[PDB]
Design a binder for this molecule. Sequence first.
Ligand SMILES: [Ca+2]
Ligand SMILES: [Ca+2]
Ligand SMILES: [Ca+2]
Ligand SMILES: [Ca+2]
Ligand SMILES: [Cl-]
Lengths: 120, 120
Amino acid sequence: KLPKILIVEDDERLARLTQEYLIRNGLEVGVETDGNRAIRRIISEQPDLVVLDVMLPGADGLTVCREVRPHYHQPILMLTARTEDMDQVLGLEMGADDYVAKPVQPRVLLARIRALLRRT
Amino acid sequence: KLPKILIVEDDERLARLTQEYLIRNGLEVGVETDGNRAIRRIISEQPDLVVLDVMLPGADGLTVCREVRPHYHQPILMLTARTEDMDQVLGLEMGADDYVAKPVQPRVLLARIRALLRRT
Ligand SMILES: [Ca+2]
Ligand SMILES: [Ca+2]
Ligand SMILES: [Ca+2]
Ligand SMILES: [Ca+2]
Ligand SMILES: [Cl-]
């Protein structure tokens, strides 16, 4: 009954800090650091929501979004370390549900995760 | 067994003039004016190439690309009646194969359709 979140992020330090905060707030959270494994993992485990970094070893965020959408219908929240309008429009038009600039306050990330889960 | 083209254009007038020209030039051509109907028709009829307007009643051209690309792998030539900033990059990155601003001379459109069909 706890929402399952998958954090796809290559920055291990930030990913674990975020995972611990979300677990303390009633979420079941896993971490993936590779785009290729993230594609198979998202399709196989079917998490309730994905937090997806744009730049990853292997498949980048846009590729992950494109490859899972036909087999994964749950929300995708993208995170970026640099605010560029082009990448934000492409991420949303590719099928992402949100696109947030890093760094994001942990409580804001949780509020955005809860908002996305309300329409599933 | 001519190449099958689907023109997805809500401007019925231009669509029929283009259809007439392409049929006279050795192509089998159908016309669709609604984006939601274009998604179902592209996936079920599997045309050899789609000429896709970016602005349609129902699903927009970017939505048509996003929804057909998992099930349709033939060329998509996108058309726009008004160039907007970032429009070409988004369509090409979404899976379109070309992006042309109207008005396009009919002979130029035929040359572009033939060039795309050579990539198959
Ligand atoms: Ca990264
Ligand atoms: Ca990469
Ligand atoms: Ca139009
Ligand atoms: Ca529309
Ligand atoms: Cl994990």
